[PDB]
Design a protein around this ligand. Structure first.
Ligand SMILES: CC(C)N1CCC(NS(=O)(=O)CCNC(=O)c2ccc(Cl)s2)CC1
Ligand SMILES: [Ca+2]
Lengths: 234, 53
């Protein structure tokens, strides 16, 4: 995350961090329930084998609330394409159940129609993660969050050198130096409604980070709600 | 506007116009309140809530 503030105690409880053989966080994820994690499909290729850590806010200490979980099943969308990053979504089934507690809780899954007309029409959403705080910098050790404005789809497309499919949407600022960045991928984009946070997107990609005239590109979660439910039933 | 377009139809969460009028519903881990609008957490750590303890 570039700019924004760091997640204070209990502010981003649905944040999940994917770690490699070296226990290094390369991507983010979102807790959907005690057994399932939502993440980006492209993240599944940035590590040959990984685990899932929840309840962590500082990757260089031990608040005691951290918990590592092993992945039992990896359910990638069979239509994901590395060429365009379309269908950039995947669901992880954990071997052991997550124990909800301080800093460890799931985000809610909304219904498609309500979500599109009420959540996505809101002014902003919130992205978070352990990604870089600068395009060229290194992964952040403290979990951060950033309020990102929904971007008019038209502007979105006109500003992108790459095709913005209908399974994507833009969020962020045109010139303000705040945006998600490398490492936040697969992470949470949630929208607040009456103090309840709903999963509205997956940190997908962007041309660099916080670049002027560019926006953050997210996987439109509402377009995969049925797919997500299916993935979770089994 | 009208119904669900009017302050989410006074619903806490999901709002949908069924046979005209309004119908409220809640995400998993919540149960619709008696008033048929508010959503009550059915246990600790309900989805979408920042944790206090
Ligand atoms: C196939 C096309 C769509 N490319 C996807 C990766 C893109 N590079 S990138 O996203 O890995 C650069 C680093 N930025 C990020 O990871 C993100 C920035 C904002 C969000 Cl949201 S993710 C370049 C375009
Ligand atoms: Ca820690």
């Amino acid at each position: 995350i570039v700019g924004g503030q760091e997640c204070k105690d209990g502010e981003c409880p649905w944040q999940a961090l994917l770690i490699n053989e070296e226990n290094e966080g390369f991507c983010g994820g979102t807790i959907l329930s005690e057994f399932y994690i939502l993440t980006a499909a492209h993240c599944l290729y940035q590590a040959k084998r990984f685990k899932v850590r929840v309840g962590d806010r500082n990757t260089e200490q031990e608040e005691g609330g951290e918990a590592v979980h092993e992945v039992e099943v990896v359910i990638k969308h069979n239509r994901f394409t590395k060429e365009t990053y379309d269908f950039d979504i995947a669901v992880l089934r954990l071997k052991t159940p997550i124990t909800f507690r301080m800093n460890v809780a799931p985000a809610c899954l909304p219904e498609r129609d309500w979500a599109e007309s009420t959540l996505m029409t809101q002014k902003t959403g919130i992205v978070s993660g352990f990604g870089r705080t600068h395009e060229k910098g290194r992964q952040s050790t403290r979990l951060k969050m950033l309020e990102v404005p929904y971007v008019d789809r038209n502007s979105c497309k006109l500003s992108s050198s790459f095709i913005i499919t209908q399974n994507m949407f833009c969020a962020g600022y045109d010139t303000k130096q705040e945006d998600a960045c490398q490492g936040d991928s697969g992470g949470p984009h949630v929208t607040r409604f009456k103090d309840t946070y709903f999963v509205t997107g997956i940190v997908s990609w962007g041309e660099g980070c916080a670049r002027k005239g560019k926006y953050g590109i997210y996987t439109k979660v509402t377009a995969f709600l049925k797919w997500i439910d299916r993935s979770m039933k089994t | 506007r009208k119904l669900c377009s009017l302050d989410n139809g006074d619903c806490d969460q999901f709002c949908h116009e069924e046979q005209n009028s309004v119908v409220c519903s809640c995400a998993r881990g919540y149960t619709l309140a008696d008033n048929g609008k508010a959503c009550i957490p059915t246990g600790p750590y309900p989805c979408g809530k920042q944790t206090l303890e």
